[PDB]
Structures are given as structure tokens and as C-alpha cells.
From a paper:
[name] proteins are programmable nucleases that have defense and regulatory functions in both eukaryotes and prokaryotes. Here, we describe a new class of pAgos that uniquely use DNA guides to process RNA targets. The biochemical and structural analysis of [name] pAgo (PliAgo) reveals an unusual organization of the guide binding pocket that does not rely on divalent cations and the canonical set of contacts for 5’-end interactions. Unconventional interactions of PliAgo with the 5’-phosphate of guide DNA define its new position within pAgo and shift the site of target RNA cleavage in comparison with known Argonautes.
To elucidate the mechanism of guide DNA binding and cleavage site selection by the newly identified D-R pAgos, we determined 3D structures of apo-form PliAgo and of its complex with 5’-phosphorylated guide DNA (P-gDNA, 18 nt long), either in the absence or in the presence of Mg2+. The structure of PliAgo was determined by single wavelength anomalous dispersion (SAD) method with SeMet labeled protein at 3.28 Å resolution followed by extending the final resolution to 3.1 Å with a native crystal. All crystals were formed at nearly identical crystallization conditions and belonged to the same space group, containing one PliAgo or PliAgo-DNA complex per asymmetric unit. A crescent-shaped PliAgo molecule contains the N-terminal-L1-PAZ domains on one side and the L2-MID-PIWI domains on the other side, similar to other eAgos and pAgos such as TtAgo. In contrast, the C-terminal 18–20 residues of PliAgo are disordered in all the structures indicating that the C-terminus is located away from the 5’-end binding pocket and does not interact with guide DNA.
Numbering used by the authors: 1 to 766
Write the structure that this text describes.
Amino acid sequence: MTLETTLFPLEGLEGLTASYQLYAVKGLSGLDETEYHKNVNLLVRRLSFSMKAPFVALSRDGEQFIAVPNYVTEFPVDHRVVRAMVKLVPTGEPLNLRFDAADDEYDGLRLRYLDFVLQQPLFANHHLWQPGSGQPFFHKKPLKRLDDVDLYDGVSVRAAKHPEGGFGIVCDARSKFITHTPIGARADRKRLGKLINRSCLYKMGDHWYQFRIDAVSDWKVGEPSLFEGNVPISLAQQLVRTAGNAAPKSIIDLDPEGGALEYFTSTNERRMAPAELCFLIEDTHGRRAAKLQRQTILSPSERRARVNGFIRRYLSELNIGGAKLSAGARAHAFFTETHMPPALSFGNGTVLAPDTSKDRFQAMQEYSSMRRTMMLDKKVGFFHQDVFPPQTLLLPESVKKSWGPAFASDFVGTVQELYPAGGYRPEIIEYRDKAYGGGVPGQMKALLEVAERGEIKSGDVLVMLHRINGAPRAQDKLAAMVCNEFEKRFGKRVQVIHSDSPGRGYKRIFKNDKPTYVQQRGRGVNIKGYLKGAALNKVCLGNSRWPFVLRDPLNADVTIGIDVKNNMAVFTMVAEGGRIVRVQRSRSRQREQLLESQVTQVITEMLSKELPEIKKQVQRVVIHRDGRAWPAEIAGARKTFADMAESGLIAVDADVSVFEVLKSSPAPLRLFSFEEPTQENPKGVINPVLGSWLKLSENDGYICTTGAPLLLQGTADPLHVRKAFGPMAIEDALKDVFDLSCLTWPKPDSCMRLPLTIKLCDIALF
């Protein structure tokens, strides 16, 4: 019950002046929304870099408001580029922010100043470096060698509210992989062309930083490519002109014939960097280098050790205006009650409840196992049991002619054993996967023409696609294409599997003097496991046959997940206790953001259909956003529900709350609990228990949706949720985030870090 954080308190901030002066930006007041905030955050960075002061943006009312420190002297007030010229009219009332104070709306302002000053000792340490603004600091010396790629260890350091009052520091260990040798001066023009969009570490003498390769320069390092006052100057000459004092040999003795790269500054200037000084960052999720990935998974005691070691070594001294701000040696620790997993309802009126008489750890593991075994027991089974509507299995022709039939036979039987009530009996159809070209167009040509023939009787289809590109850090545009077209022109609900992984499970055999495909089970896939998993996710879940639901009400009557990536939005809606789940995709006019009118359309459309099956009057709605919530999205959700409270579809005093679900947290914190130290674990640090949680603030909490009994390796990564709007108390949102993440439908005997609401969003996009 004893949990330690990676929160370290900050002392000697006791009544420290932080003085600001609000300005407001007239700009180009046309708000393209996504474009409006790119430029806002563009100017704050440009202004911050040029005057070396903590400029911030405060989005309330007009969403402008750049906060200028009172201590800056000359201030341009007018700023060029940015299309139409911008003007900043000061809003008076200079704010002297205290750090001993209660919660303000200027706490975002206070956290930014605190953030800015905290990285000055770090940015000045010659032995550390930072990839870009806002990122962790890494040691210049690599931790580990790993045979042509280097492993660098870093620590993110972010300011945050302390739940006992005042301010503190949250940290986490990070790893970055960089190839050991540079690109090199001798690498030729064609090889350099092949690196566009990759990112490399640039050791520009003592200033190390990261950039993205945008183009290859027409000019080598020693040929004049720009000018320092009219006169043409080589890149080699430029690095000499901007070196200091005892510049390293490496930056003044560059091969004149080496090539140079070009990149854009975080203010969009173009710069060059010599390939002799550039080191490719190894995207290991792009190229499966898993022995590399293994070096990155740290035990809880390693992770704790690296963070505490870092704290005591680099944030020990910090003089800001003389002030002596110490980071305490003791991370914040507290006693808390841990959420028990919720009672669950299965088929045949059977509930699964955590056993409160066994000890917590043994009870959680029995519980987690029982979600699978109850789901599979023909005596209890799925909560929702019914015949499937007609189904279709759409296979490539090359597959129907080889192992398709054995796979389909095995697959149907797997569905019927997992979900006996369904009577899965799919029509098996094919498309001419070799008639048109095997790229995305051509695969799609054959698919549309099967559709156009009307060969997909039935509204549900499971179609087997070929993998076009691998690289798990890619976009499978074929799958999205098939769903967009099959949903939009025909009435199809489509689920996707690929042909490579099941195909590895079958080998051809000669039996009774006839070729046959039979399962194999050496190395490559576990075909039985694949068959069970695909049966649950593609057939059962794809027909909304939920295996189990919450027995008890969440704090919210309805929670809606929202993710938008790559101009495609997903809305999931969970009501009852997961008894009612709906997922709508919709195209988006911006890459990662939604128009207000679009939010209000999709949600009233989705909810209106479902309201007659929500048999309790609705009075709490929650929205879970993946990442940042945008003001136009909030307006659409408050408008949607204020409307329904007036129609009578919902309680006249219903309320909305908006929470950002930060699967990639901007302020990542760890939680540990403790154990007897034991040879193998000299400090006795273990993962936190499954339901552990911590709030820092009314707006910021963390729940271990993953944790002690149920993790295989590594240390639990607490899910950061941040309150964007609304009455609901942050503690309540964390509790039913936890309860929603116990609906582990894609893999019941496992833990699941995301609540079901936004997990369904990642599934629908991925």
C-alpha cells in the first residue's frame, strides 16, 4: 500500500517572484485552428530563443495571450513573417506568481517558467545534451555498445504540482539508439539521398542536438554555399566562424569533399550539417531489432536507480536570481488505497469479483486468469450470446487455391469453440489478387470488383489482405482503404487480417496420395494462438459480442473516446457497463484535430441511436481524448450535451467533463512499491500493484492500468490523464479509467494500459 513516486519536491521556492506581463496577439486573426496554434507556438519559440526568456501561451478567451517576463528590457511588440504582421497589445496587470499559492489558472504559466529555468543548468552541463526543446537530457557518453548502434541513457525532467502543496519535479529514464559511426564524409550523393526524413544526432562540436534530414545540399562542405556579408562562404568556413575558444578538432578539420545535409530549424530556417558529424538515429520499431529492444526494458530497481542517481548528480545546484532551489533527496512517497478491479458480468448470470480474502497479489492473478477461463467455459461464457448474422470470409485467390481451405476450416472451428452460440458459418469468397499488380492500387481494384459483383452478400466481412509494406512504423494504407470503401459504397462492416502470419502456420503435406495443408508448429507463429486471437477480435468483437461487462456503474453514465490521426477520427462510446459500445470512423479536415461542428454531429448522431437502450437517465458524460484536446473539440462537446439537456434526451442538469488520455505523457512519472531486499534486488523495488494511482493536482493524475501481479517484464508505466474541462473530480475519472481498462477484451488474461474507450480508437485506426 506504500508507493513511491518519481516526484521530487522543490524547496526554496517559498515566496519567489515569478513576474509576467500578459500580451495579446493580433496576428492574422484568421483561425485555421490547427494552423493558428502552430504559429502561436512558433513565435513563442522564436521569441524564447532570441531573448533567452520563458515566453508562454495562455489559451483562455481569445486563445492568444503570450506571457512576457517583466524583466525583459527591449521588446519588439511587433513581429514579422507569419504572413500578415502581428502586434502584441499588453493586457496590463503584471502578474507576480507565487509558488506557495493555491491553484490558479496561471499554474500553467508557473509550470512553464519553472520548466525554463530548470534546463539552464542542464543545458549548460557539457556532459549532457538534449535532442530538441522539451526532450530528456542524455549523457553524451553512451551506456552500452551493442555492435554498431549505441545506447544512450537520458532522463526527462518536467515541472509539476506537488499534491502536498507547491511544486516539485517528475522524472523518468529514457533510452535513445544512435548508430555508432557517423554517416561519414566519404558517403556519396546517392547514399545521402536515401536518408531523407531520417533523423540524426549532429555533434556540432560541443553543441549536440537532433534534426530531421530534409534535403541534400548541392554544395559540399568546402564549396561556398552561402554568404557571410556578400562574400561566398563554405560550410566548413561557417563552422570555423561560429566555433569558440578551444573548438574541437572534429569541427574545424572537416573533409572538404564530404557531403552536407539540410534541415529546418525549429523556427523553419534552413541549415546545413556535414555528414562527417551526423549519426543516424536507429528507429528500432521501424526495423525489428529486438535484441536492441531488450536492452531498453529496465527493472523497477534499475529505473529507480537511474532517476535518483541523475537527480543527485545534475539538479543539485540551481541559482536563479541567487535563489537556492534544491531538489529533495527523497522522492515523494505516500500511503494510498489501491483500486480493486471491478466486478464483471459474464454469460449465464455469472459474476467475477476479486476475492477480497486472499492477499492482493494472489487475488489479482486468479481474477485475471478467470476472465479467460470464464469466457471459454460453455457453462458461463460470453455475456452476449446469439447467432451471428450472415458472415463472409474474403480470401485472396492465391490463398483459396493453396492453404485457404485448411485455414478456413480451422478458423471456423476456432470461432465455434470460443463462441459456440454464434454458429459461425461464413461464405468463403475470393478476389483476384494476382490480376492487377499487387501494389495498393490493384489489390484494391480486385477488392472493389468483388464488391461490385455483389459477391459479398451479408453486411459483415472478414477480408484477408496481403501485407504491402512491412516496417511496423508504417501505415497500412490498404486496410484503411478497404474499410473506407467497403463501408461507404456498400454496407459492409469489415475486419482485416493479413495473409503472412496465418500462412506461416500451414505446411503442405502428402496424405493419402493428395496434397493437404496441415498446421505446423515450429518457429514463426503460434498458429493455434493466432487462430484463437483472431477469432475473438475479428469475429466476436467485430460483431459486438462483448465477452464481459462491468457489473457496477461507472462514475460516468457514458464515456466517449475520441482519437483523430492522419485525417481520420474515431469515436467510441461506452454505456451501461460496456453493455453498449459503438465505434464510428469519420474523415477529418485536419491531420490531428476536429472541427466543432464535426464533434457535435458525430456525437449526437451516435448517441441518439443508442439513447433508447440506455435505461438510466443520463447525468454524467465523459470524453476521453487521445492527446491534446482542442478548443473546437471542447466547444462541440459542451454544445452537443447542453442541447440534449434542453431536448430532454438527457438530464436537464447533466454535466460534461473532458479528459486527455496521454499515452505518451509530456510529464512521465513512475510509481514503485516495496518488498524485502533480496540478493537479486538490493533495494527491494518492485512494480506497483495493479490498481495504484496518484493525483498531483485537480487536473493531473496517474493510474497504473498495468502493474505488479500482471506484468511480465519491465516496470509499470502509469497512464497520465489530464482534466481539460468539467465538474468531475479527477479522482473519479481515474477510477473509471481503471475500471474501463479492466474490460480487457482484445486479450482477457492480460493487463491493458489504455481504457477500453481509447483502446478501441487505436484498434480502429492502427
